[PDB]
Write a protein that binds this DNA or RNA. Structure first.
Lengths: 315, 299, 315, 299
DNA sequence: ATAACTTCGTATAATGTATGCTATACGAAGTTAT
DNA sequence: ATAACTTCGTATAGCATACATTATACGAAGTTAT
DNA sequence: ATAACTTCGTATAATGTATGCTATACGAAGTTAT
DNA sequence: ATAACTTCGTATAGCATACATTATACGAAGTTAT
């Protein structure tokens, strides 16, 4: 069909309308789906409902998580819907098997996971250890951890900060302007206040690195084995390296991980959010304020992160 | 008709897409609706709008709650979506009657009901009455109440509890932890970790632990009812919530939890709620909830 | 067209799906529109866009309010949409003239009106005067005014209360259950707490009237010239009489109205809402709580009811 | 084509359905889009999707804000709805590009701007500098600033103020009420109640009251700009908000109003807001607004 | 030679909610050991 | 017979997941100034 | 005979919000009295 | 000439009203136990 070829060419040509992560997973699912179709002598595009159902069961049988199985279906749905075609999910054979895959796996004990928490006590501990270091990598890392906990920003947002995005309060506290997040894409954006303590950690980093030479340099950059920073206004410190800082900091304090293979055995990119949430709840900060602080325009995710009547039952 | 044959095969093949409780309800609504169709000379499948409308009015006449009538329509809608057929709810007729039936029943003064509170005042009173009893069933029945009150767990949740899951149940009170021990002793459930914590107790007075079979939720409701009949005698003279039942401990738990005064999201995470709707409805007739105008008028 | 005849017959047959006020205005607009069409040799059903435009201009020229002109268009839109036909508003000639009618009238100084407020001071004043009366009509009236101010319920809701809808708190405060309102139609409904003061006023009314003989008797009923109440479980005290109480109470304290002809010269059915709102704001009750109290699931209307920097500009 | 002829006649007949400001913008967007179409050999009416898309990219290249590009599309959409024609926004192409253009400009670090605060610190400083001046314009300019700060009225609102509407303006400060009097005297606006409170003042130094003509909002913006140039000299070295302008007094008013600390719905009803969005954005970089985590970290 | 990355691919979390699904209710028929 | 349940059917109260992306998680392989 | 209604018809308020409409911004061309 | 504006065009920030009912507002005419 011609319309399908054009609808597809129009999405491609304007791929920037979507996140590059959306594109990477579109292709990754398509490889995986194409691979399966090839094994089974099956036509991979206009995907056929029954073929998709079998493929999802196949993923279930490979022991994959329910949310990953949902990702595959989702990308397949998108590809078709934007092609002008009906979704696999528009057929009962696929909608029904997806429920089934969910209900069975859940009933077998499968559960989504959460980032191990990075809380105030952790930050205070890491800070008391590292704040005496004159190594430039230690000063960067402490400043990062501090921003992460303070703001609840996601690692991709922290990496996108440039020097010029940093303003100030009357009191001297740093304010960081954030344009794009996962949930919002506007020119207003949001602004994030830093405590005087975290502000100092950041100032010290700016001072030792020299990132403020260009207002367009990214606040965070790499540091090579000789403690010399490498500011850049066109390449950012990768979110993988930001993950590494979290992981290195955990290892510093707790040693090496298991060889179990499981995720979330050490701090990760989302550890400061899970932990700042818990800390606010524990401090009696209001449920709306917690939401305000970590960009959430609704309860739920906060609830999962925050999870004794016995107090009452006694006299 | 082949596309409905396939769709019905799709349904049967992936039946595990829905709980067995869902299926029973679907089946129950279909029997009822088919029976009516025959009685009244109508074809039950595919459901035509004028017949569904008339059927809904018949259910109204029969005296059923708006929510019940919504169940019958919803199951009918499901039966048609998982065939290739159009939902009766999408006919203009059925849409209109359901608006009518809803506004018309509320006018007549129909009200949602909810579990008669089982509160501290009631738990202590029961504790008193059968604390110094040596009958196994009394010992089991105090343990159950203790857990239901203190945990706010639903009855299906409590039937699945196993002794290996144990005080912390995957947090209990002082005197509730002691009471669940006195049952555990006399019952002998500790013998297999994979035994269910609660099990039958027969007329001889001996307990029968089991890893394969759990106490039915009906039995657990029975414990609440028997505890009410014990005190207040044969159930009130033919409607609902005239004695305690499953949720009674949940409803009553929160009422004391708020009457004692503590954050609502503390209450919510107690029962595992995340949509305050329901917790508010349980707690609503308490003097702490009377709102700004009472506070202003009293000054 | 047959479909049109059936679509119309289906709406009629299930008219109970709509409020009887919706039906009364459907017919009232239809009379008015039919009358105009007849004057001008014009077919009134399937209404023709240009005919409708002329009719709205005609209403503007008769000096009617913008919201009444909108009511006429609205009922005409409903009639057609539920008939299966396109709305007059679906045509540019009608959408455009409606904007114009709004913008011009507003620009000429026309403004929507509000109920004159019935506030705490008014209630205290009326109460101090009438609470010494042994007339049964005075006891009813004081109890009504008190419920109206306490609950912010609308007059139709107050009239629909039956004795059995009245429960109690531990403290002794009356609670009234309300099923249907303007905004909601559910079997849960809402419940409304009464202060101890207002509760007493109500008890006294129950005692002198004898409305509690039947739990199905309406709380409020008529009282004849000899002070004998007439409880009923099938006829309610009309909302027009409830309006009269408000108007009689105003006259008692302030005397007769102007002969200007304007609305809102004395208290009315909505006077207790406008006034309880103002009182809460003035007392620093939270904006969300005000909303909670008068059934509003959103700000705006509260704002209009609640309407010196100079405090700040001075030292 | 006759149905578009009628629809365009519908538009012209009921033109008062839209403000003249709306019409100017519509006209401005149409000229621009027609000019482009000719330059690039495309038909400007009816707008085909691929051409609108290319036109939107051209606007991006031209360096315009996402909000500007939304204006051009919106006016084009209006032009097509009030004809019988389909909105270009409803083509898949245009939908995609607008997503792209938006995400792509935010990436590049484009930011909404807003009026440079005019706050107490600034009002007192200006008061100082031209309080003891006897030039009419200085006396008028202090009165205007006084009102703008104290009322938070928009400039179009202030141009329409008449002396019969007057201190209460259908509430002013002590020293602002005094300053508006000293202008009223020297100006002689009190002479006709239907004179506008603010009027021109010519190079000779005499005022010209008028009931028919008001000060343009451009003049009122001019008062803000002249007051900035007076102090800080020729405007900052080619973009926006480098001096005060219309809303400057509004933005600056709330900043002090919150820095001084008072309820946000008090602030909102001051300026006539009812959607906190904007008031929050003005007040946001103040130490009182730094949120729970700063409060927690500082302990 | 190696610290400290980057780039990459599979894997999976997260982002809000309305009404479609799944719970409890409870009279009562059925079942089994005492 | 019957206590003390289980299974059932159908009433009614009460949760949680499908939807369309966009983000992180983490081992591994390539990179580059020391 | 009349208080205290009821019923009724025209008239109009109210009920929530998203993005379509209407504001301000500001360089600059045009205008008029000094 | 030029101060001190107004009119303009096009940029960008910021409100408010169309949508589908459902309710009240109030004078007037009919009603009914005193």
């Amino acid at each position: 069909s011609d319309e399908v070829r054009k609808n597809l060419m129009d999405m491609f040509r304007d791929r920037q309308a979507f996140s590059e992560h959306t594109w990477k997973m579109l292709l990754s699912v398509c490889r995986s789906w194409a691979a399966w179709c090839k094994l089974n002598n099956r036509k991979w595009f206009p995907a056929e409902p029954e073929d998709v159902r079998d493929y999802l069961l196949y993923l279930q049988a490979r022991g994959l998580a329910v949310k990953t199985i949902q990702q595959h279906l989702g990308q397949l749905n998108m590809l078709h819907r934007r092609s002008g075609l009906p979704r696999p999910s528009d057929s009962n054979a696929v909608s029904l098997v997806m429920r089934r895959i969910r209900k069975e796996n859940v009933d077998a004990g499968e559960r989504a996971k959460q980032a191990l928490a990075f809380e105030r006590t952790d930050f205070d501990q890491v800070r008391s250890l590292m704040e005496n270091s004159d190594r430039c990598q230690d000063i960067r890392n402490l400043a990062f951890l501090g921003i992460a906990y303070n703001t609840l920003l996601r690692i991709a947002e922290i990496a996108r900060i440039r020097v010029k995005d940093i303003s100030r309060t009357d009191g001297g506290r740093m304010l960081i302007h954030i344009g794009r997040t996962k949930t919002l894409v506007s020119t207003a954006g949001v602004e994030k206040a830093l405590s005087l303590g975290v502000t100092k950690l950041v100032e010290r980093w700016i001072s030792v690195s020299g990132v403020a030479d260009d207002p367009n340099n990214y606040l965070f950059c790499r540091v090579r084995k000789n403690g010399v920073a490498a500011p850049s206004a066109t390449s950012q410190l990768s979110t993988r390296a930001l993950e590494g800082i979290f992981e290195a900091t955990h290892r510093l304090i707790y040693g090496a991980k298991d060889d179990s293979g499981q995720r979330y055995l050490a701090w990760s990119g989302h550890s400061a959010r899970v932990g700042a949430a818990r800390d606010m709840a524990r401090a009696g900060v209001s449920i709306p304020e917690i939401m305000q602080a970590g960009g959430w325009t609704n309860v739920n995710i906060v609830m999962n992160y925050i999870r004794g009547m016995v107090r009452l039952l006694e006299d």
